[PDB]
């Protein structure tokens, strides 16, 4: 019944189907075979050295399998005809697919490429262009080949006795068509064949996702022990909601899903808002509307105050635009596919969306609301051709008295001026001429002629870039030349650091400007449920009416000059207190228009993908005889080149459209005057543009309809506004006039905010893709498991799947099934390093690198199939660990000796016990600067060489610096060659480090002297005693598996800040701020320098020791006081090694905080500050395992008896982890510390 | 040159921790190769007195 | 060199004599 016994039979059966002649034993750590293909056999034929048997050996091992080398069997990969056992179905979706195909008739500039038919022996001017696009657009790179994904569902559908539709349309693709593509399993980036259609990998990636989405639901529906979902009155089947959706996209899935995701997201926002009894989850927090310290009460219901408000004309107009958006996506697919049926289950819900209720306390309404958010992720990573279009500023709106353009431009001048003043109070100033060159390392140049040169030329220019996104179409990224970005670095620096803090008060009548705007970081620091608690409590409040407008194509109306001049007017007038000092000869007012000049951002030439027209061939050669030029600009491989646009537009249209065309030089590609995403002021400026617009929003509402709609909060983030207001009348006519004056303010600014995008609702909040509904948490999961952003190279396979399980902690936290999230990792633990070995071996002997023989030079590489239960063997024993009973608990080596002593885990961890100390090891790979360096570095580099070299060869730790500059020089050649060149070196290392591997007995629970881990708690016993309250805590995030619902029930959501971040990580906060310190060195780096010397003779010998790290000099103050603090304050000198409590579900719980100790911990008082953390980090995993089993909630107490022999073993083992014997003569630390002097008298 | 016993300063000069002074700093320091040459200048002037 | 080590529990009072193996 356990996941380790039932699930391991399935992943073994996948290997029993994939490599069909493999005898697999579970109790072996990893079995080894090999296989080869003749793509490399043909190559050394061409160099002269012919081979003995060309394909005779291939005949020997196809189906007889009778040959095996060195005793190691040789087994072939399965063909495509057999991955579904030759099954066939009716599959009405598949016959919709095959009539929705079209050859040689597509528009060559288009966003998401349609169904092109592959006909063999066709032309090399169209079909090579279509093969050029699909090689860039349709790529399924990642960590797992897509072939074994299709075999995995074939094995998984049999056990659940349920057939997914993604396999039904795939099983008809195997009997009529042989092989869709040839993905090489070594690199996963090459797809060199399409047999019937160019969009065949998109056909599978939307099918290998379609199958998991209904295995996720059907497993979850039995966990809630309900038959089907329940819209507010009627029964509804969730799989029919997806099968009605999968048929509609299947003509053109990247285009259909991008226009159908808008009514699906809008439906979940406005569901339970119009019903008269409304059930909320009563919350309580601070007086500010943005306070995050929230306390939850039980569920209750209340009468709706806004019942008659939804009879208005704002919602009735907004609903028919969304019912149109359903119908336009339908009519585009009713003709391109043969189907006459569409969406019959969803259309019955949108006709009455407001008045139907939604109750979160029943699970049959929370799964359905989560499912519709997770519908849209089948066609992940929309990769799209973009075209190069210009400014076209005749459409740019000129400032007028009748328009608000000049009033917007004078508002935003007073906001950059105000951000500079309020950064002066937080000690954020401009950079100085002294540290101008030192402060240039914040990015990864400066010449008086290179700074005066322009870029509005065909000869020299700027070059665009592009990077992908999860569901959206591919957004651009701007690459600016580094000569003219440093003038933007010097003047936008006290704005990047100022809005970097997380705290803020958002009141409109407050005078300050920093709290009301906020720019987050790359990763969400903390959880998502934890730091979005201000969104939850305002959907649970009867008197908050939130307004959140949306700007469609924000840059096209940021293109206007009104925010360009008004920003630069406020830059110049605020540099007036800095008007005397000169930057390298010239003033500061001259250099701001070197980063915001005319040939910098006003009018610059940009080169993207080119314009191109589809024409005939006979008229092409009659004109191309005069203009055959190249060399100025390049042309894609399908297209035929000409010189200019003016000879390319005269022959433009053709009924046959045989051959393509492209202008190389005479194009005049693109000129843009718009705030770039690449500048240092991207997220600072456009969020201030929402502030200048949003302040004009409150004025016209207050001047046309006064007394109504008072404003209480103002949150401005990237391309979003969020007003927390309250409405003072439930009127049908008056509210219709207030909602009209909001759109008239945006339209008279220049933008066009859609009435279907604008949100004016009482009981629903969306903010930065976090949906809050009626006091609870409705989650989406757009993160996916098949595709990826770029091709991923598995360099640290110990640390890759340890990082991949973090993105599987989040998935089950949004409602994915817990055990289905175990089966995915147990599949994904065997198929990672299978093709990372160079040459073949013979077992129980040496490992052959060179062969020089015709037999073994055919069997090139090996296969390494690890056991599926390598997920559960803990770290430090050459395999990564996650616990089977709960995914959020880190399996460590002290947890392995505990989890076998518990009676409720003798059945689950019975097959785990036989594979420990059985697994193979892990593929664990590991001039200008004379100006841009601190004077700690320049004095150390301009030294006499007789003094500079003694810090390099004999002595010195020196983890950052000139050799790290060489590592920074190794980081810039890293991307192609240095990753590949050392990959030839680690493989010769890994064969020796595998042949010298002996599976060693006598596991140890301990660490070195100068560090300690969570395994320190095994010195003492632990007695589960006491009794606590069995009160079920209340929490907003419903929709969890029972392995996660019971951890949040017994242990509530946290209410304070966690204390377990030790003072070793308090100085990491000092090293987190500096980006010249953040990406390079940290606490494990800086404590090794304290390991080289403690207890010096003067503090003036103390401040200077980290200038010898040659990074900074200011933060040696924080290392002056804290070492003086640890000379005053007690400390255990050791560090803390851990890998636990970092995933975003553990940060939400009330574990590892100061209020967690006071009820769940009882420890002896003779323990230091970093020893009580090692007990508490042990104590967190014990209680989370105590709750996820069903064991009774007790108070964990570590006990020290009076057994005078056992009191001696503790005083012997606490001593050696505090002070080292031999290393005292290395550090020359004094033993007269107060903490280490107590150890004589602690336990006695 | 013969140093004294290292316990003759440990029981009486650095005997009380949580206090430092002029003497308690000088005990934790070893002479360089040139300060040890100036000790040789002290002991030459004590043998040839005036 | 030539240092020896044994099973000791006195953290301060025995490592005083450990430098006597050094000197």
Which residues make Cβ contacts (< 8 Å) with residue A382, sequence separation at least 6?
A112, A254, A258, A468, A469, A471, A472, A473, A474
CB contacts, 8 Å: C13 with chain A: 1240
Helices (H), A955-1041: 962-972, 979-995
Tokens standing for residue A919 = 């697994």
Q: Tell me whether B28 touches chain C (CB under 8 Å).
A: no
Strands of A720-726's sheet, edge to edge?
A: A710-717, A720-726, A545-548, A759-761
Q: At what angle do helices A238-249 and A363-373 cross, to 10 degrees?
A: 10
Distances from the Cα of A451 to the Cαs of A447, A482, A594, A595, in angstroms?
A: 6, 10, 7, 9
Beta carbons of B29 and A1097 less than 8 Å apart: yes
Within 10 A of A627 (CB to CB), how many other CB atoms are there? 16
- Could you please report the per-residue DSSP string of A265-321? HHHHHTSTTS-SEEEEEEEE--SSTT----EEEEEEEEE-S-TGGGGSHHHHHHHHH
Burial class (CB in 10 A: 0-12, 13-18, 19+), A140: buried
Tokens standing for residue A1193 = 């909630």
Tokens standing for residue A1179 = 């104590």
On whether the CB atoms of residues A40 and A856 are closer than 8 A, the answer is no
Give the integer Cα–Cα distance in Å for A1090 and A341. Answer: 72
Q: Tell me whether A1101 touches chain B (CB under 8 Å).
A: no
CB contacts, 8 Å: C19 with chain A: 1225
Burial class (CB in 10 A: 0-12, 13-18, 19+), A853: exposed
Distances from the Cα of A787 to the Cαs of A170, A254, A790, in angstroms?
A: 18, 15, 9
Distances from the Cα of A120 to the Cαs of A87, A124, A136, A656, A1241, in angstroms?
A: 28, 11, 21, 20, 87
- The maximal CA–CA distance of chain B, rounded, in angstroms, is 45
Give the integer Cα–Cα distance in Å for A793 and A382. Answer: 21
CB contacts, 8 Å: A1097 with chain B: 25, 28-29
SS3 A855: coil
Beta carbons of B17 and A1237 less than 8 Å apart: yes
The upper half-sphere exposure of residue A924, i.e. CA atoms within 13 Å in the direction of its Cβ, equals 12
Q: What is the enclosing helix (H) or strand (E) of A1120?
A: helix A1118-1128
SS3 A527: coil
On whether the CB atoms of residues A884 and A842 are closer than 8 A, the answer is no
Within 10 A of A1169 (CB to CB), how many other CB atoms are there? 13
Q: What is the enclosing helix (H) or strand (E) of A1013?
A: strand A1011-1013
Give the integer Cα–Cα distance in Å for A1111 and A964. Answer: 11
Q: Tell me whether A475 touches chain C (CB under 8 Å).
A: no
Please identify which residue in the block is written with the tokens 């056990």: A159
Which CB contacts under 8 angstroms, 24+ apart, belong to A931-937? A931/A437, A932/A437, A932/A438, A932/A440, A932/A441, A933/A438, A933/A1110, A934/A438, A934/A1107, A934/A1110, A934/A1111, A934/A1112, A934/A1113, A935/A1113, A936/A1107, A936/A1108, A936/A1110, A936/A1111, A936/A1113, A937/A961, A937/A962, A937/A1110
Name which of A203, A299, A199, A308 is nearest A246 in CA terms: A203
Give the integer Cα–Cα distance in Å for A373 and A770. Answer: 11
Give the integer Cα–Cα distance in Å for A1128 and A1137. Answer: 24
Tokens standing for residue A168 = 């039904």
Tokens standing for residue A44 = 């050394």
Give the integer Cα–Cα distance in Å for A983 and A1011. Answer: 32
Tokens standing for residue A607 = 């080169």
The residue in chain B having the minimum alpha-carbon distance to the alpha carbon of residue A1230 is B28
Beta carbons of C23 and B6 less than 8 Å apart: yes
SS (H, E, C) A856-908: CCCCCCEEEEECHHHHCCCCCCCCCCCCCCCCCCCCCHHHHHHHCCCHHHCCC
Q: What is the enclosing helix (H) or strand (E) of A326?
A: helix A313-336
Distances from the Cα of A654 to the Cαs of A28, A638, A660, A664, in angstroms?
A: 66, 18, 11, 21
Strand pairing class (A1023-1025; A1011-1013): unpaired
Which residues make Cβ contacts (< 8 Å) with residue A521, sequence separation at least 6?
none
Q: At what angle do helices A3-18 and A820-827 cross, to 10 degrees?
A: 40
Distances from the Cα of A187 to the Cαs of A40, A246, A530, A625, A1102, in angstroms?
A: 15, 30, 39, 43, 51
Which residues make Cβ contacts (< 8 Å) with residue A304, sequence separation at least 6?
A274, A275, A276, A277, A278
The single-letter DSSP state of residue A500 is G
Name which of A1172, A1176, A1198, A1140 is nearest A891 in CA terms: A1140
Rg (CA), chain B: 14
The upper half-sphere exposure of residue A901, i.e. CA atoms within 13 Å in the direction of its Cβ, equals 7
Rg (CA), chain C: 9
Q: Tell me whether A1228 touches chain C (CB under 8 Å).
A: no
SS3 A987: helix
Q: Tell me whether A1240 touches chain B (CB under 8 Å).
A: no
Name which of A814, A700, A682 is nearest A374 in CA terms: A814
Please identify which residue in the block is written with the tokens 């949580």: B18
Q: How far apart are the first and last CA of chain C?
A: 10
Q: Mutating which of A1221, A1228, A1233 best tests the C interface, going by the most C Cβ atoms within 10 A?
A: A1221
On whether the CB atoms of residues A369 and A773 are closer than 8 A, the answer is yes
Q: What is the enclosing helix (H) or strand (E) of A716?
A: strand A710-717
Q: Tell me whether B7 touches chain C (CB under 8 Å).
A: yes
The residue in chain A having the minimum alpha-carbon distance to the alpha carbon of residue C6 is A1221
Give the integer Cα–Cα distance in Å for A114 and A256. Answer: 11
Give the integer Cα–Cα distance in Å for A510 and A502. Answer: 18
SS3 A1195: strand
Tokens standing for residue A406 = 């000049």
The upper half-sphere exposure of residue A1008, i.e. CA atoms within 13 Å in the direction of its Cβ, equals 10
Name which of A655, A656, A662, A613 is nearest A635 in CA terms: A662
On whether the CB atoms of residues A1093 and A1227 are closer than 8 A, the answer is yes
Beta carbons of A1232 and B17 less than 8 Å apart: yes
CA distance A573 to chain B (A): 56
Q: How many CB pairs under 8 A join B and C?
A: 6
Tokens standing for residue A931 = 């100006």
SS3 A1149: strand
The upper half-sphere exposure of residue A359, i.e. CA atoms within 13 Å in the direction of its Cβ, equals 15
Name which of A1177, A1170, A1172, A1217 is nearest A1063 in CA terms: A1170
- Could you please report the per-residue DSSP string of A380-448? -S-----------TTSSPPP-SSSSHHHHHHHTHHHHHHHHHHHHTTT--PPPSTTTTGGGTT-----T
Q: At what angle do helices A313-336 and A253-269 cross, to 10 degrees?
A: 160
Q: At what angle do helices A146-160 and A3-18 cross, to 10 degrees?
A: 130
CA distance C16 to chain B (A): 9
Give the integer Cα–Cα distance in Å for A246 and A166. Answer: 9
Name which of A1135, A978, A1142, A1000 is nearest A1067 in CA terms: A1135
Which residues make Cβ contacts (< 8 Å) with residue C17, sequence separation at least 6?
none
Please identify which residue in the block is written with the tokens 């699970």: A363
CA-angle at A477, arms to A388 and A416, nearest 5°: 110
Give the one of A1095, A1232, A1234 whose C-beta lies nearest to B14's C-beta: A1232
Beta carbons of C19 and B6 less than 8 Å apart: yes
Strand pairing class (A612-615; A659-666): antiparallel
Give the one of B18, B25, B29 whose C-beta lies nearest to A1234's C-beta: B18
CA distance B5 to chain A (A): 18
- The maximal CA–CA distance of chain C, rounded, in angstroms, is 23
Give the integer Cα–Cα distance in Å for A939 and A246. Answer: 67
Q: Which residues pair with A295 in a beta bridge?
A: A284
The single-letter DSSP state of residue A611 is P
Q: What is the enclosing helix (H) or strand (E) of A726?
A: strand A720-726
Beta carbons of C11 and A1224 less than 8 Å apart: no
Dihedral, A563, A566, A572, A573 alpha carbons, nearest 10: -150
Tokens standing for residue A559 = 């293109």
Q: Mutating which of A1232, A1233, A1234, A1235 best tests the B interface, going by the most B Cβ atoms within 10 A?
A: A1232
Which residues make Cβ contacts (< 8 Å) with residue A173, sequence separation at least 6?
A94, A180, A203
Name which of A1139, A710, A1144, A723 is nearest A894 in CA terms: A1139
Give the integer Cα–Cα distance in Å for A275 and A207. Answer: 38
Beta carbons of B28 and A1230 less than 8 Å apart: yes
The upper half-sphere exposure of residue A486, i.e. CA atoms within 13 Å in the direction of its Cβ, equals 19
Give the integer Cα–Cα distance in Å for A582 and A579. Answer: 8
The single-letter DSSP state of residue A556 is H
Q: How far apart are the first and last CA of chain B?
A: 23
CB contacts, 8 Å: C11 with chain A: 1215, 1218-1219, 1231, 1236-1237, 1239-1240
| Sign of the CA dihedral with A19 first, then A25, A29, and A32 last | negative
CA A59 remoteness from chain centre: 46
Give the one of C5, C12, C19 whose C-beta lies nearest to A1240's C-beta: C12
CB contacts, 8 Å: A1215 with chain C: 9, 11
On whether the CB atoms of residues A69 and A861 are closer than 8 A, the answer is no
Distances from the Cα of A739 to the Cαs of A318, A463, A472, A756, in angstroms?
A: 12, 43, 30, 13
């Amino acid at each position: 019944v356990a996941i380790t016994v039932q699930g391991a039979q399935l992943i073994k059966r996948v290997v029993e189907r994939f490599y069909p002649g493999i005898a697999f034993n579970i109790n072996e750590g990893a079995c080894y075979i090999y296989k080869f293909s003749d793509h490399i056999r043909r190559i050394r034929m061409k160099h002269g050295t012919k081979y003995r048997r060309q394909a005779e050996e291939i005949i020997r091992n196809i189906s007889l399998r009778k040959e095996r080398l060195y005793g190691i069997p040789v087994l072939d990969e399965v063909e495509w005809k057999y991955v579904f056992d030759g099954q066939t179905f009716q599959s009405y979706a598949f016959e919709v697919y095959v009539n929705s195909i079209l050859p040689w008739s597509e528009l060559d500039p288009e966003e998401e490429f349609l169904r092109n038919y592959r006909v063999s022996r066709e032309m090399t001017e169209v079909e090579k262009f279509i093969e050029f696009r699909a090689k860039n657009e349709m790529q399924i790179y990642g960590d797992i080949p897509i072939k074994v994904w299709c075999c995995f569902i074939n094995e998984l559908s049999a056990e659940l006795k349920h057939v997914p539709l993604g396999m039904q349309v795939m099983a008809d693709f195997v009997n009529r068509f042989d092989s869709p593509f040839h993905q090489g399993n070594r690199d996963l980036s090459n797809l060199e064949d399409f047999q019937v259609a160019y969009t065949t990998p998109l056909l599978f990636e939307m099918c290998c996702m379609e199958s998991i989405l209904e295995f996720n639901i059907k497993m979850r529906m039995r966990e809630e022990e309900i038959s089907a979902l329940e819209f507010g009155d009627m029964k509804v089947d969730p799989v029919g909601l997806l099968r009605e959706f999968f048929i509609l996209c299947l003509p053109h899935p990247k285009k259909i899903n991008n226009v159908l995701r808008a009514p699906y997201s809008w439906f979940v926002k406005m569901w339970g808002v119009g019903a008269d009894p409304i059930v909320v989850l009563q919350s309580t927090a601070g007086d500010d509307r943005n306070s995050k310290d929230v306390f939850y009460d039980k569920f209750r219901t209340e009468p709706n105050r806004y019942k008659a408000l939804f009879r208005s004309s704002f919602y009735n107009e907004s609903r028919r635009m969304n019912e149109e958006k359903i119908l336009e996506a339908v009519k585009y697919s009713q003709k391109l596919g043969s189907h006459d049926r569409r969406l019959p289950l969803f259309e019955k819900m949108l006709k009455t969306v407001y008045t139907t209720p939604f109750y979160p306390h029943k699970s049959s309404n929370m799964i359905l609301a989560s499912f519709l958010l997770s519908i849209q992720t089948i066609t992940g990573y929309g990769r799209a051709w973009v075209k190069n279009v210009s400014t076209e500023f005749d459409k740019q709106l000129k400032p007028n008295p009748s328009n608000l353009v000049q009033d917007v431009s004078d508002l935003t001048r007073e906001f950059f001026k105000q951000a500079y003043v309020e950064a002066k109070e937080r000690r954020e100033e401009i950079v100085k001429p002294e540290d101008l060159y030192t402060s240039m390392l914040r990015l990864a140049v400066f010449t008086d002629e290179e700074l005066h040169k322009k870029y509005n030329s065909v000869e020299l220019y700027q070059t665009k870039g592009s990077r992908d996104v999860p569901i959206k179409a591919t957004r651009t990224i701007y690459s600016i030349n580094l000569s003219v970005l440093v003038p933007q670095l010097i003047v936008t620096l006290p704005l990047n650091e100022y809005f970097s803090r997380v705290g803020g008060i958002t009141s409109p009548d407050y005078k300050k400007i920093g709290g009301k705007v906020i720019v987050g970081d790359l990763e969400a620091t903390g959880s998502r449920v934890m730091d979005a608690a201000d969104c939850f409590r305002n959907s649970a409040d009867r008197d908050i009416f939130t307004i959140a407008i949306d700007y469609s194509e924000y840059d096209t109306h940021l293109t206007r000059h009104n925010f360009r001049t008004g920003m630069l007017q406020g830059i110049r007038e605020a540099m007036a207190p800095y008007r005397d000092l000169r930057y390298e000869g010239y003033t500061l007012e001259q250099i701001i228009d070197f980063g915001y000049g005319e040939g910098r951002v006003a009018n610059t030439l940009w080169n993207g993908k080119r314009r191109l027209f589809k024409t005939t061939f006979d008229a092409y050669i009659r004109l191309d005889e005069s203009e055959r030029d190249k060399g100025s600009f390049k042309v894609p491989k399908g297209v035929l080149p000409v010189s200019s646009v003016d000879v390319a537009n005269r022959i433009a249209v053709d009924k046959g459209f045989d051959t393509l065309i492209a202008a190389t030089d005479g194009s005049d590609l693109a000129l843009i005057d718009t705030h770039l995403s690449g500048e240092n002021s991207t997220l600072i400026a456009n969020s201030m543009h929402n502030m200048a617009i949003g302040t004009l929003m409150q004025r016209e509402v207050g001047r046309e309809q006064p007394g109504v709609l008072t404003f209480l909060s103002e949150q401005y983030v990237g391309d979003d506004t969020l007003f927390y207001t309250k409405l003072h009348t439930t009127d049908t006519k008056v509210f219709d006039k207030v909602a009209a004056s909001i759109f008239d303010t945006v339209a008279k600014c220049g933008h066009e905010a859609s009435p279907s995008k604008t949100m004016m609702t009482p009981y629903s909040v969306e903010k930065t893709q976090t949906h809050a509904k009626q006091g609870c948490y409705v989650p989406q999961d757009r993160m996916m498991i098949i595709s990826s952003e770029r091709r991923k190279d598995i360099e640290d396979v110990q640390g890759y799947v340890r990082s991949q399980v973090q993105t599987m902690i989040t998935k089950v936290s949004r409602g994915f099934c817990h055990d289905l999230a175990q089966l995915i990792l147990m599949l994904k633990t065997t198929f990672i390093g299978a093709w990372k070995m160079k040459r073949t071996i013979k077992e129980d002997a040496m490992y052959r690198d060179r062969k020089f023989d015709s037999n073994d030079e055919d069997g090139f590489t090996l296969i390494q199939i690890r056991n599926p239960l390598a997920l559960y063997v803990p770290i430090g024993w050459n395999g990564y660990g996650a616990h089977p009973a709960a995914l959020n608990i880190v399996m460590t080596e002290e947890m392995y000796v505990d989890s076998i002593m518990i009676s409720k885990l003798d059945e689950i961890m019975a097959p785990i016990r036989r594979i420990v100390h059985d697994i193979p090891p892990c593929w664990n790979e590991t001039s200008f600067f004379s100006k841009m360096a601190r004077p700690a570095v320049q004095a150390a580099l301009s030294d006499p060489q007789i003094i500079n070299l003694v810090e390099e060869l004999p002595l010195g730790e020196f983890s950052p610096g000139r050799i790290s500059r060489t590592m920074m020089h190794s980081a810039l050649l890293k991307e192609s060659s240095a990753r590949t060149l050392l990959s030839s070196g680690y493989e010769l290392e890994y064969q020796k480090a595998l042949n010298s591997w002996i599976t060693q007995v006598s596991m140890r629970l301990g660490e070195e002297s100068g560090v300690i881990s969570t395994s320190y708690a095994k010195l003492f016993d632990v007695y589960f005693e006491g009794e606590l309250d069995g009160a079920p805590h209340m929490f907003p995030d419903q929709n969890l598996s029972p392995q996660f619902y019971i951890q949040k029930m017994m242990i509530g959501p946290r209410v304070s800040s966690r204390v377990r971040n030790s003072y070793v990580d308090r100085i990491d906060v000092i090293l987190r701020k500096d980006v010249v310190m953040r990406g390079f060195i940290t606490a494990n780096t800086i404590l090794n320098v304290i390991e080289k010397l403690g207890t010096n003779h003067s503090v003036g010998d103390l401040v200077t020791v980290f200038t010898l790290m040659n990074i900074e000099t200011r933060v040696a103050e924080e290392l002056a006081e804290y070492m003086t603090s640890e000379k005053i304050r007690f400390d255990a000198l050791k560090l803390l090694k851990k890998g636990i409590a970092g995933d975003e579900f553990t940060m939400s719980l009330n574990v590892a905080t100061q209020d967690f100790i006071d009820t769940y911990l009882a420890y002896p008082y003779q323990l230091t500050k970093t020893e009580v953390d090692a007990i508490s980090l042990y104590c967190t995993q014990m209680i989370m395992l105590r709750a996820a089993l069903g064991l009774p909630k007790k108070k964990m107490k570590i006990v020290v008896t009076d057994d005078a022999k056992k009191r001696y073993k503790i005083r012997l083992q606490r001593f050696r982890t505090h002070v080292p014997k031999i290393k005292v003569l290395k550090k020359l630390i004094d033993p007269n510390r107060m903490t280490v002097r107590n150890l004589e008298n602690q336990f006695v | 040159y013969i140093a004294p016993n290292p316990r003759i300063s440990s029981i009486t000069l650095t005997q009380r921790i949580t206090t430092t002074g002029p003497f308690a700093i000088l005990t934790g320091s070893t002479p360089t190769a040139q300060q040890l040459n100036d000790v040789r200048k002290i002991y030459l002037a004590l043998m040839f007195p005036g | 060199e030539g240092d020896v080590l044994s099973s000791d529990s006195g953290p301060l009072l025995s490592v005083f004599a450990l430098q006597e193996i050094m000197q």
